[PDB]
Amino acid sequence: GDQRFGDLVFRQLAPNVWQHTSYLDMPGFGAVASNGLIVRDGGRVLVVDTAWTDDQTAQILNWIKQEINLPVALAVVTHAHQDKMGGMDALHAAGIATYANALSNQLAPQEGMVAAQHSLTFAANGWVEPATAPNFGPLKVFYPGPGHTSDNITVGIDGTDIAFGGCLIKDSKAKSLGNLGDADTEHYAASARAFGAAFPKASMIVMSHSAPDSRAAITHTARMADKLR
Ligand SMILES: Cn1c(=O)cc(CP(=O)(O)O)c2cc(F)c(N3CCCC3)cc21
Ligand SMILES: Cn1c(=O)cc(CP(=O)(O)O)c2cc(F)c(N3CCCC3)cc21
Ligand SMILES: [Zn+2]
Ligand SMILES: [Zn+2]
Numbered sequence: 723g724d725q726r727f728g729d730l731v732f733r734q735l736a737p738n739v740w741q742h743t744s745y746l747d748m749p750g751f752g753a754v755a756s757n758g759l760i761v762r763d764g765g766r767v768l769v770v771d772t773a774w775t776d777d778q779t780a781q782i783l784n785w786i787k788q789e790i791n792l793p794v795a796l797a798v799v800t801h802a803h804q805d806k807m808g809g810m811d812a813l814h815a816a817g818i819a820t821y822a823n824a825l826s827n828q829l830a831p832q833e834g835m836v837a838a839q840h841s842l843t844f845a846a847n848g849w850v851e852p853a854t855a856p857n858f859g860p861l862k863v864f865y866p867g868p869g870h871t872s873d874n875i876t877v878g879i880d881g882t883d884i885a886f887g888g889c890l891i892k893d894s895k896a897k898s899l900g901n902l903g904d905a906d907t908e909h910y911a912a913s914a915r916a917f918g919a920a921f922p923k924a925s926m927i928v929m930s931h932s933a934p935d936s937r938a939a940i941t942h943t944a945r946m947a948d949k950l951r
Contacts, residue, residue: 727785730778736882738762738860741928742782744773746805755931756805759886761879762790763859769797769818770861770877770886772809779809783816794818798855798863799838800888801874802829803904805930810836821855823865825873842875848920850875864920866890868906869913869947878921885924887917892946893929894938899946910947914940 725732731743740760745753758771760782767786772779786794798821799807807830813820814836822830822838830837842854842863850863860880868874870889878885890913892899899910906913918940927939 725785725789727788728781730773730781730785732760732785732789735759735884735926735928735934736879739879739882739884741934742769742771742773742785744775744778744782746774754805757928757930758800758806759877759879759884759928760786760790761859761861762792763795763861765792766795767792768859768861769794769813771800771806771888772797772813774805774808776809776812776815779812780815782809783812795857796821797838798822798842798858798861798875798877799826800876800886801871802826802833802835803871803889803901804833804835806888807833807835810838814839823873823875826875829871829873844875848916862921864917866916866920867909867913869910870901871904872906874913876917876920878924883923883925884928885917885921885926886928887914887930887940887943889930890914890917890943891927891929891939892943893932893935894942896939896942896946899943899950907947907950911944911951914944914947918944
């Protein structure tokens with residue numbers, strides 16, 4: 723059961739949680755999926771990650787208007803790469819309050835990304851400071867340490883068994899840690915395990931580029947990353 727709306731795919735994961743999927747052609751790879759989330763929280767909708775492009779991100783917003791018809795209160799992005807932050811201007815055009823790791827906002831301009839309007843900071847134990855993430859409701863935001871990038875953050879949805887590590891986590895069948903261009907190979911394994919320890923009851927781990935996996939995706943990722951220390 724996958725709903726198509728223009729060039730995007732939406733899959734219901736839980737009564738109030740959908741996965742959004744957008745595609746971009748990468749040389750040597752064909753069509754590449756990127757996933758984020760849509761969370762209904764009573765009278766509003768929360769978005770995790772843009773699509774690869776502004777136009778794709780506008781089609782997420784049109785799907786929400788058509789199928790949910792509740793306002794989008796806020797969007798949070800998980801790191802400053804095109805797949806997760808490439809649609810930032812589409813959210814600003816729609817009057818949506820946008821949030822990212824302070825470091826994501828620092829890195830976005832050089833990456834040709836638009837920074838979010840708001841900078842998240844994190845407590846010593848990795849949990850977001852609520853003063854920087856006001857009104858996040860069931861979105862629990864966690865900085866596990868550097869991994870895929872120095873800025874990568876993760877989210878869990880309270881009231882569900884769902885967590886999302888973005889590009890930090892690979893699926894359980896992966897043969898690679900993927901993009902090591904911006905990665906911290908020394909801390910990667912510990913950051914993967916920190917994410918699993920932050921959401922220990924999550925049984926559905928949403929993947930960045932493939933279908934949802936089990937906690938075996940977290941374990942598999944940490945074991946591959948163990949080999950680089
Ligand atoms: C080979 N490969 C993957 O398998 C998975 C991914 C996705 P992720 O695991 O990093 O999230 C990937 C990303 C890249 F940027 C990438 N390069 C970028 C320059 C050319 C190769 C390769 C990747
Ligand atoms: C080639 N390439 C990129 O340049 C950037 C990205 C974005 P990021 O993942 O670094 O944030 C990327 C993601 C993929 F999943 C990907 N594939 C997934 C399996 C095959 C190739 C390639 C990518
Ligand atoms: Zn990335
Ligand atoms: Zn990725």
